[PDB]
Design an enzyme around this catalytic site. Sequence first.
Site, mmCIF file in Angstrom:
data_model
loop_
_atom_site.group_PDB
_atom_site.id
_atom_site.type_symbol
_atom_site.label_atom_id
_atom_site.label_comp_id
_atom_site.label_asym_id
_atom_site.label_seq_id
_atom_site.Cartn_x
_atom_site.Cartn_y
_atom_site.Cartn_z
ATOM 1 C CB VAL A 1 8.107 -0.764 -1.145
ATOM 2 C CG1 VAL A 1 8.808 -2.098 -0.940
ATOM 3 C CG2 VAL A 1 8.313 -0.257 -2.564
ATOM 4 C CD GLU B 1 -2.861 -0.903 -0.184
ATOM 5 O OE1 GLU B 1 -3.653 0.032 -0.422
ATOM 6 O OE2 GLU B 1 -2.668 -1.854 -0.968
ATOM 7 C CG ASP C 1 -2.153 12.442 1.430
ATOM 8 O OD1 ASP C 1 -2.831 12.841 0.450
ATOM 9 O OD2 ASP C 1 -1.577 11.329 1.457
#
Length: 306
Positions: free
Chosen positions: A21, A16, A127
């Site tokens: 990675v 995810e 975010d």
Amino acid sequence: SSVVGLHYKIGKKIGEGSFGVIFEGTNIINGVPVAIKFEPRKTEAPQLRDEYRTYKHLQGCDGIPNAYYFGQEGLHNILVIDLLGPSLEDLFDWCGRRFSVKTVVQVAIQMLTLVEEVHRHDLIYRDIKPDNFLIGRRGATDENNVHLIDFGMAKQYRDPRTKQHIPYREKKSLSGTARYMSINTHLGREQSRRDDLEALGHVFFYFLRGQLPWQGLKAPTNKQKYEKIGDKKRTTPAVTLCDGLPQQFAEYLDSVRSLPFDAEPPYEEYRMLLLSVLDDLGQACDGDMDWMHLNGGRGWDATINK
Ligand SMILES: Cc1ccc2c(-c3ccncc3)c(-c3ccc(F)cc3)nn2c1
């Protein structure tokens, strides 16, 4: 080598976060399961080490996993944190891409608390999206509580000692997730505390309706696509987003949108506003969530859901 950071055995990949990675793993000393994020060791804009310090800066806060190791190991850079469960986006999908009003209120106040304590440590998150809010692991104390991960977009918004706010500013590059980002972000304005909260209000309506009206727009380019989404956000009144839904969500989005650039939002007042939805509907804030009824009452399972 099957082991990184001295103590962490690498396990299944879960890839995810940027496809960025990630693996699951186990601490070979105490069996504690962990998430392990690698990052290419030479980069222009490396985020892993300041993300490690961000987890340490927020250490002890509830809903923020511990960071146990940041290090070397040759080709990449490694960050090891607590292993958590699926994201709210994942559970949203398994529940039919719709959350009940009760589930949205309960998740909303926990998300407001999460963001607040990020803000209380002099950071804005920048975010906000359901993919970065994770529940716990099964049979754990915090199995169905909301957690927050991925602080690669985080920025200091006030000096920690003086507590003075960053200057207002414009013509910033639009990046983040266009579906949820604040209107101010669309216009290239410097983000602040209010923008994390407006983004949360977008997620709340996303959960409540199943879709936001600026989804599925198209344009020749990405920049033009971002502009059309931003235009839709400003011509859609909060009262029309919340047609058929409890009006406290429209009042929430309207109020955080009108917050001054440096103002400290009234987090507890926002939490009481959303809590009043449950009172108007005769519901209790007992922690029962939609995804806890999945699969006969067992909850999400890997074989059936993902
Ligand atoms: C979109 C998305 C979903 C899950 C997730 C994990 C995550 C998944 C399951 N359990 C814990 C974390 C983390 C992560 C970030 C930094 C790190 F060092 C280790 C893990 N990013 N990330 C990003």
